[PDB]
Amino acid sequence: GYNDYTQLICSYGDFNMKSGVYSTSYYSAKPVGAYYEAHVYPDCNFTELFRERAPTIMQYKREVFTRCNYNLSLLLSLVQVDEFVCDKITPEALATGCYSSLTVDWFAFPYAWKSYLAIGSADRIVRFNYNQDYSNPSCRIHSKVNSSIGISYAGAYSYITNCNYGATNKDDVVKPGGRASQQCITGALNSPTTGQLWAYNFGGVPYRVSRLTYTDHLSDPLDMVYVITVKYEPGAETVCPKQIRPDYSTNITHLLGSCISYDIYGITGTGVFQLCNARQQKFVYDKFDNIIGFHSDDGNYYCVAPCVSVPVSVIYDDKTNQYATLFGSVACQHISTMAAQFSRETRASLVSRNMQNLLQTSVGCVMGFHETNDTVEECHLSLGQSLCAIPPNTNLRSGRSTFGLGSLAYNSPLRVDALNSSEFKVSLPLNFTFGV
Amino acid sequence: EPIDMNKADGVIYPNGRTYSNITLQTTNLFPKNGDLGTQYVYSASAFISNYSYYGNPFGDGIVIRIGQNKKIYPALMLGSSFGNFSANNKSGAYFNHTLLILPSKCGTVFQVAYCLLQPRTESKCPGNSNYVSYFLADTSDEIRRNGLRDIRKFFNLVNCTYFEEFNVTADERAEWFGIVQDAQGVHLYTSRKNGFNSNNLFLFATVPIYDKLNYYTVIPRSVIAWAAFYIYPLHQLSYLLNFDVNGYITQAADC
Amino acid sequence: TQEYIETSIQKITVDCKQYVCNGFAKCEKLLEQYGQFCSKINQALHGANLRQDDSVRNLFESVKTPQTVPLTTGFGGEFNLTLLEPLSVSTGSSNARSALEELLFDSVTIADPGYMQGYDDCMQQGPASARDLICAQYVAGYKVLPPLMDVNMEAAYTSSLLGSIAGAGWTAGLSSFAAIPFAQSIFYRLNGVGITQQVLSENQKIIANKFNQALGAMQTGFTTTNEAFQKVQDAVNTNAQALAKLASELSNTFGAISSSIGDIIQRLDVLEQEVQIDRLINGRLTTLNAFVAQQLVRSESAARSAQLAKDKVNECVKSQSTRSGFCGQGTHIVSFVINAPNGLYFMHVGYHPSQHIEVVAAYGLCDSANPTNCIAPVNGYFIKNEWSYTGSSFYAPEPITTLNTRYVAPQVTFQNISNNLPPPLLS
Amino acid sequence: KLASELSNTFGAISSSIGDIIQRLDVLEQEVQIDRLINGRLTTLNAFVAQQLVRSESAARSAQLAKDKVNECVKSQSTRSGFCGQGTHIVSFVINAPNGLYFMHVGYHPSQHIEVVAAYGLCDSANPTNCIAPVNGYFIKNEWSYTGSSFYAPEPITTLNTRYVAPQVTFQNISNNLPPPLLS
Amino acid sequence: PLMDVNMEAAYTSSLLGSIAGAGWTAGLSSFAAIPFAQSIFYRLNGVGI
Amino acid sequence: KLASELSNTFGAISSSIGDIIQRLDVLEQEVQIDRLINGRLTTLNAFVA
Ligand SMILES: *[C@@H]1O[C@H](CO)[C@@H](O[C@@H]2O[C@H](CO)[C@@H](O)[C@H](O)[C@H]2NC(C)=O)[C@H](O)[C@H]1NC(C)=O
Ligand SMILES: *[C@@H]1O[C@H](CO)[C@@H](O[C@@H]2O[C@H](CO)[C@@H](O)[C@H](O)[C@H]2NC(C)=O)[C@H](O)[C@H]1NC(C)=O
Ligand SMILES: *[C@@H]1O[C@H](CO)[C@@H](O[C@@H]2O[C@H](CO)[C@@H](O)[C@H](O)[C@H]2NC(C)=O)[C@H](O)[C@H]1NC(C)=O
Ligand SMILES: *[C@@H]1O[C@H](CO)[C@@H](O[C@@H]2O[C@H](CO)[C@@H](O)[C@H](O)[C@H]2NC(C)=O)[C@H](O)[C@H]1NC(C)=O
Ligand SMILES: *[C@@H]1O[C@H](CO)[C@@H](O[C@@H]2O[C@H](CO)[C@@H](O)[C@H](O)[C@H]2NC(C)=O)[C@H](O)[C@H]1NC(C)=O
Ligand SMILES: *[C@@H]1O[C@H](CO)[C@@H](O[C@@H]2O[C@H](CO)[C@@H](O)[C@H](O)[C@H]2NC(C)=O)[C@H](O)[C@H]1NC(C)=O
Ligand SMILES: CCCCC/C=C\C/C=C\CCCCCCCC(=O)O
Ligand SMILES: *[C@@H]1O[C@H](CO)[C@@H](O)[C@H](O)[C@H]1NC(C)=O
Ligand SMILES: *[C@@H]1O[C@H](CO)[C@@H](O)[C@H](O)[C@H]1NC(C)=O
Ligand SMILES: *[C@@H]1O[C@H](CO)[C@@H](O)[C@H](O)[C@H]1NC(C)=O
Ligand SMILES: *[C@@H]1O[C@H](CO)[C@@H](O)[C@H](O)[C@H]1NC(C)=O
Ligand SMILES: *[C@@H]1O[C@H](CO)[C@@H](O)[C@H](O)[C@H]1NC(C)=O
Ligand SMILES: *[C@@H]1O[C@H](CO)[C@@H](O)[C@H](O)[C@H]1NC(C)=O
Ligand SMILES: *[C@@H]1O[C@H](CO)[C@@H](O)[C@H](O)[C@H]1NC(C)=O
Ligand SMILES: *[C@@H]1O[C@H](CO)[C@@H](O)[C@H](O)[C@H]1NC(C)=O
Ligand SMILES: *[C@@H]1O[C@H](CO)[C@@H](O)[C@H](O)[C@H]1NC(C)=O
C-alpha cells in the first residue's frame, strides 16, 4: 500500500520478479466515513407481552410486528433471562438491523421443563401444543418476569397430552409454526384436569382429548417463554431499531467519492458513492444481484460501486527497477475523484494534481508515461491494442523516470510493382546468408 | 376459462425485490396449468344459487379471476370449521372465528372482518327452520357498509378482533385476487397495481389470523349471466418465470 | 469451402483478494488458512495470458510475407477480388479491414467491452442484460485484457498476405518473388492439375465467370445455414459463458446464511461467523480453481488450433496444396484468409466436376515394328476414339504430341498400334 | 503444489492430526479431521487433473516432434515455414530436458534486385516450338537464364529449359535465337 | 525417465550420422554414404542455385 | 466413477437423504444434507471437466 510497486510485490508473493505488465490488488483501501439512512416509524407496542395475563401453552398468543421501531434495551430490563437458544441470529444481532416482519410467540411455561421444548424432543408438548418453525432465524428465550412489571397468572394453565380422531385413531399433531386445532381445544376445555381421555364428537367425527395442568408450577417470578422469529426480505424492510448506529452520519454529500461503510436499511457493506443522473424501487440491482445504485430520501440518485473497482495494472522492468501504472478502461478525468482508494504515493500524486502524470490511451489512463513516436519490434511490456511500453534507461536510484508510450510498428515488406503486361518483374537475391 | 401460463395467469409476484429481464426458477404456491377452476355466477334478473352449502377446502390458498378474460365482485366467507346449522339440518354454518370479505357499495368499498357468526332467531334467518340461504342484496355515505348491513341481518357478529376497509376505483377490465395463509397470518393479493398489462398478484394487506383456515364459501349475491368469477386452487409447484423489461412476469412454465 | 480456426483464448485477470473477500479483514485473516492462494491464482493467470500472447506473436510471425505487390483497384482482372481487397484501396476510409471482414464482424454479436472508457460507460448507463457481463468486471473483480494487436495491424498482415498470393510458389525455393498477375497464376494453377493450355485459352471467360460466382456467393453465406459461421458464434458464446461463470457465483450462499460477508458478520457471533465465512471462502476458492483449470484446458486447445492455422496458412494460402482433403474438397486452386473474432477464417476454392463421362483408356502405346519404343502420357490418359490425349481433369480429345508424352520401358499391358502412329512413335 | 498444501489447516484448528486428536473431544475432532481430509483430497484431485491435461499436451508435442524429425532432420523439407523461415537447407536435433531441441539452417537473401522476366520464349519462324525455364527465369539483359535463388545470368541451354505448348504471353524473338530454339 | 542420457545421446548421434544420406534418391530402402559437403551442395542446387 | 461415488457418505452420518431426514432434527438435516450435496456436485463437476 505504499507504492504500486509494493502492491505488485505483495501480490504474486515474491521480491525478485521478471519484467512485464501485471494485474495488481489493492492494499490501501479502508472505509473512512460511515453512512446510515433508515425510515422512522411509530414505536412497537409490547404491552401485551409483559403487562397482561400470561397465556397458556395450549392456546399461546402470537403477535406479528410490522412497520414499527423497537427498542431491545428496554425489553431486556423487564425480564431476567435464564437461557436463550437462538438458531441463525444472536440477541446482539436482534438489537440491530431491519426486518420485514417480527413474530413473537409467548406463553407461560415452567423453567424445569426446558427439555420439553428443545429441538428433537418426542414429548407430548411439542407434539400437541407448540411446534417451533425453525425455517426462519428464530431465538427462544426463557425468562422470569416480575409481578411488579404487570404480568399475572390466573385460571388454569393446561397442555394437551393426547388428541386423536377418527376410527383409526390418527394423532392430531401440530405443524411447525402452528397451534392446536379448535377441535382439540374444545375437547380439552371440557376434559378433566387429572388427565382422563374423554370422548367427544365435533362435526360428525369422533375426537378424543386429554390434558394436564401445570398451574401449580408457577410462582411470583413467573417463568415465561418468548419465541422471536424474524424474516429477511431485502427491499421490504420495515422493523428497525429506534437507536441510530453511533458512528454514522446521516448526510452523504460530504462522503461522496470516499470508501465508506453504509447501513442503509438494515444491510451492511462498504463502497464508494457517487452522484449520477439515472423509480419503481429504491435499490437498483444488476443481473447478478449486486446493488449498483439507490434512491435517497431527497431528490438524488447515488450509484454505488465496491470499495475497489478500478482495474490497476503495473508496468515493471526488472532491470533499472522502474515502474508505471495503468488504470484500465477509465478516463483520466475520473481518477482524481477516486484517489483515496489507491496506494499512498499514488494518492499523494493525484491529490495536489500534476496533469503531466495522466495520459489517455486506447487501453485506459496511464501514469508515469510520456508520449513518444519510437517503435520497438520486441514487445515485453505489452499494454494491448498494439501498444508497448518503452522502459527508461535510468535506474531507480537516480530518481523515477517516465516510460515511453506507443510502439509496435509494422514490418512493411518490400514492394514489387506489377508491370501488368506480357512480361513481369522478379525480385532476385544478389547476396545470401544462413540463419539458424 | 383455464389457467394459461403464457399469459402468466394467477402467478404471485415474489415479495421484496423487483426483478427485471431475468428468468427465475422458484418453487412456491402457484396455480396448476390447465385448471378450469369452479365457475360462480351471480344473477341480475332475489335469485341466488346454493353457493352457501358447499364448504370448499381451502388448501394452501386460492386465486380468483374476476370479471372478463358487468364485473361483479365476489363475496367470501373463510373459516376453520364447517358444519350444519342447528334445528334445520342446513349446511353453511361456520364455527369459531370466521373471516368475511364483503363487497359493499357497487364493488368499490370492501369490508374485511374476522369474527364469530351467531345465527339470529327470526323468520328466514339461520336456526329458525324457515332457513333457505343467506345472501347479500344490492351519494351520501351510509351505503359504504351496506354489505355489512346485509350480512348482520343473518348473523350477530358479536366479538370482532380485526376490521378494515379498502377503497377500490370502479373499472371493467380483468382483475385477480388471491388469499394465502402462512405463519405470519393471512395474505391478500391483488393485481390493482394497474401498471402496463399487470395481471400479476402483489401483496397489499395482511390479516392477523393465526388459526388455520380450512374452508371457504362463496356468499351468494343478487343485483336488482352478468357475473362470472373462477376460483382456482394453489399448489406447491415448481415454476419458471420470465420477467420483462418493465419488471413484470410475462411467461411462466409449470415444470 | 469455409473453415474457421480459433487461435486464441480470452485473456482474463482476476483480483483474487477482492473476489474471495469483499474488503473484510476477518475474511482476509481466515483466507490465510488456505495458504498463498491469491498469489498462485495471479501467477497462473499471468502465465496463461503471457503464453497466449506469445502464441499470437508466433502465429503472426508465420504470416511474415517478405515481399508483396501493392494492392490496386484492378486485382485479378476478370477475376473479381474486390470482396477480399482492403477497404482503403477501395472506396472511402483508410482502414485495412476488407468488406468481407466488416461483414463477418458486423453479423456476429460480440458485445464489445470498450477498453478506453468502459468504466465510465458502465457508470453512466443503467442496468441492462446485454452489457451486464461487461459491467460485472468492475463489480465482481475481474478484467478482460485487450488483444496484443489492433485490428488495423491484423488487417495489414492479411492484406500483405493477399498481395503476395499470386507471386509466391512460382518456382523452386522461396527466395525469389515474381510479380505475375492473379489471372496468370490462376491459369497456371489450373494447368498444373491437368487442364490443357488449349482448353484454358478457349474457355477463359467461362472460368472467370465461374470463379466470380463462387466468390460472390459469399454475400449471403453468413447466415444460420453456414457451419463455420456457427463455429464463430459458439466460440464467442463459450467465452461469454466462461465469463458469466466467473460472475453469478458471489450470489451463492454455499450453505451459509447469506452470500455476503457483512450480513454474516452482523447476524452471528464471533465463533459461528468463522465457519460461515469459511463456507463462503471455500465456495469462492472452488469457483476460482475451476476457472483457472478451464483456462489451462482452453489454452491447450488454442495452441493446437494455432499450430493447425499455421500450417493452413503456410500450406494452402501461400502455395497450392496437392495433398488431398487438407484444404476443402475437390482439387485445391487458391485459398484466402481473413481475420475472424478470436481466430482466422479460411476460404478454399475447389475444382469440382459437375458431369462425368466414361471412356476406355490405355496404360501406354508401343510400336509393332519397334516394340522397344513405347510412350506413356503425362498428366493425362490415352483415350480411344485411334488414340488421342486427354487432360485427366477435363474431357478434351487432343492429338498426341511429344509435349504430353514420355518414353518409358515396354510393358505387357501396353497396346500395340500399326497404322496412324503418333509422331512420338514415328521412326 | 503438493508439499505446500500439507501445511494448510483448511479451516481446522491445526495443520496436523496429532494435535487435533489431543486438543479436542472425540466428537469434535471428527469434523476437523474430515476438513483436513477434504482439503488434501481436493489437492490430490487437482494434481491428478493437471497431470492428465499436461500429458495430453505432451502427447500433442510428441506427435509434432515425430512429424518434424521424419520431415526435416531426416529429409529435405520443401515445405514453407514448417521448419524455419526462408528455404530449409538442413536441420539438426539434440536432446533437451524433457524434450528435443531443433536447429533449422535456412537460406536467407540479404540484398534484392528487380529484373524483367518472361513466361517463355518462342521462335517467330516456328511458332509451335516454345520453351520455358525449369528452376529459374528468362531474364532480359538479349535473354539469359538465371537461378531462382541467386542472381547469376547464364546462356540458355537445353539442360535448364523444356519444350512447352505455345501461348500468347510468350515473347517473340527473331533476331538472336538461343540454342534450344535454333532449328 | 526410462532412458539414460547415454542412450538418448546414442540415438541422436546415430541420427546425425545419417543426415547426408537417407533421401538421396526416391525410396527409403537404400542408404548412400555421401559426404556432408556434397549433400549440402546438392540441396542448394535443388533449392535453385 | 459416477456409479460408485453415490455410495459415499462424504462425512455425513449416511449416504441416503432419507436416513438423514429420519434420524436428525431439522437444524442438523440441512447441515448433513449439504455434506452430501457438496460431494455430489464435486463428482459431477469432475466428470464434466
Ligand atoms: C399498547 O397496547 C395496550 C393494550 O394492547 C394499549 O392499552 C390500551 O389503551 C387504550 C387507549 O390508550 C385503552 O382504551 C385500553 O383500555 C388499553 N388497554 C390495556 C389492556 O391497557 C396501549 O395504549 C398501547 N400503546 C400505545 C402507545 O398505543
Ligand atoms: C431504549 O430503552 C432504554 C431503557 O428504557 C432507554 O434508556 C433510558 O433513557 C432515558 C432517557 O434519558 C433515561 O432516563 C433512562 O434512565 C434510560 N434507562 C436505561 C435502563 O438506561 C433508551 O433511551 C431507549 N432508547 C430510545 C431511542 O429511546
Ligand atoms: C369453537 O366453536 C364451538 C362451537 O361453536 C365451541 O363449542 C361450544 O362451547 C360452548 C361453551 O362451553 C358450549 O356451550 C357449546 O355447547 C359448544 N358447542 C358445541 C357445538 O360443542 C367452542 O367453545 C369454540 N372454541 C373456542 C371458542 O375456543
Ligand atoms: C366474547 O368476549 C368476551 C370477553 O372475553 C367473552 O366473555 C368471557 O367469557 C369467558 C367464558 O364464559 C369468561 O370466563 C370470561 O370471564 C368472560 N370475560 C368477560 C370480560 O366477560 C365472551 O364469552 C365472548 N363471547 C363468545 C360468544 O365467545
Ligand atoms: C503388345 O505387344 C507386346 C509385344 O511387343 C506384347 O507383350 C508380350 O506378351 C507376351 C505374351 O506371351 C510375352 O511373352 C512378351 O514377353 C511380351 N513382351 C513385352 C515386351 O512385354 C503385349 O502383350 C501386346 N499387348 C497386348 C494388349 O496384347
Ligand atoms: C509471339 O508470337 C505468337 C504467334 O504469333 C503470338 O500469339 C498470337 O498473339 C496474337 C496477339 O498477341 C493473338 O491474336 C493470337 O491468337 C496468338 N496466336 C496464338 C496461336 O496463340 C504471341 O502473342 C507472341 N508474343 C507476344 C508477347 O506478343
Ligand atoms: C427408546 C426406547 C427404548 C429405551 C428405553 C430406555 C430408557 C428410556 C427412558 C427415557 C426415554 C427418553 C428418550 C428421550 C429422552 C428425551 C425425551 C424428550 O424430552 O424428547
Ligand atoms: C419485584 O419487584 C419488587 C418490588 O420492588 C421487588 O421487591 C422484588 O425484588 C422484585 N423481584 C425480583 C426477582 O427482583
Ligand atoms: C448535507 O450537507 C450539505 C453540504 O452543503 C448541505 O447542503 C445539506 O443541506 C445537508 N443535508 C442535510 C443536513 O440533510
Ligand atoms: C447529467 O447530464 C448532464 C447533461 O444534460 C451533464 O451535464 C451532467 O454532468 C450529468 N450528470 C452526471 C452526474 O453525470
Ligand atoms: C510525434 O509525431 C507527431 C505527429 O505529427 C508530431 O506532432 C510530434 O511532434 C512527434 N513527436 C516527437 C517527439 O517528435
Ligand atoms: C346445489 O344445487 C345443485 C343443482 O341441482 C345440486 O346438484 C347440488 O347437489 C346442490 N348442492 C347442495 C344442496 O349442497
Ligand atoms: C349435516 O347433516 C347431514 C344430514 O342431515 C349429514 O349427512 C352431515 O354429515 C352433517 N354435517 C356435519 C358436518 O355434521
Ligand atoms: C337435524 O338432524 C338431527 C340429527 O338426526 C335431527 O335430530 C333433527 O331433528 C334435524 N332437524 C330437522 C329440522 O329435521
Ligand atoms: C376510503 O375512502 C373514504 C371516503 O373517501 C375515506 O374516508 C377513507 O379514509 C378511505 N380509506 C382509506 C384506507 O384510504
Ligand atoms: C431486456 O432483454 C431484452 C432481450 O433481448 C433486450 O432486448 C432488452 O434490451 C433488455 N432491456 C434492458 C433494459 O436490459
Residue numbers in the entry:
A (entry chain B): 343 to 620, 624 to 781
B (entry chain C): 50 to 94, 103 to 126, 143 to 211, 219 to 304, 312 to 342
C (entry chain C): 782 to 1166, 1174 to 1215
D (entry chain B): 1026 to 1166, 1174 to 1215
E (entry chain B): 928 to 976
F (entry chain A): 1026 to 1074
The publication says:
Merbecoviruses from bats, pangolins, and hedgehogs pose significant zoonotic threats, with a limited understanding of receptor binding by their spike (S) proteins. Spike (S) protein is the major viral surface glycoprotein of MERS-CoV and forms homotrimers. For the MERS-CoV S-trimer, NTD is known to mediate cell adsorption by binding sialic acid, while RBD is known to bind the human dipeptidyl peptidase 4 (hDPP4) as the entry receptor. The S2 subunit mediates membrane fusion and exhibits a higher level of sequence conservation among CoVs.
In addition, S-trimer structures of six merbecoviruses from different animal species were determined. All locked-1 merbecovirus S-trimers we determined are found to bind fatty acids in their RBDs, while fatty acids were also identified within RBDs of locked-2 SA-BatCoV S-trimer (right). In the locked-2 SA-BatCoV S-trimer, the modeled LAs were bound in a different conformation. Although the locked-2 S-trimers of CN-HedgehogCoV and SA-BatCoV are similar in overall S conformation, no fatty acid was identified bound in the RBDs of the locked-2 CN-HedgehogCoV S-trimer (right). In the characterized merbecovirus S-trimer structures, the putative LA carboxylate group interacts with a serine from a neighboring RBD via hydrogen bonds. In contrast, S-proteins of CN-HedgehogCoV, EU-HedgehogCoV, and SA-BatCoV are unlikely to bind sialic acid due to changes in key sialic acid–binding residues. Recent reports suggest that SA-BatCoV, MOW-BatCoV, and HKU5-BatCoV bind to ACE2 using different binding modes. RBD alignment showed that HKU5-BatCoV and SA-BatCoV also differ in Loop7, η3-β8, and Loop10 regions, while the sequence of MOW-BatCoV showed insertions in the Loop7 and Loop10.
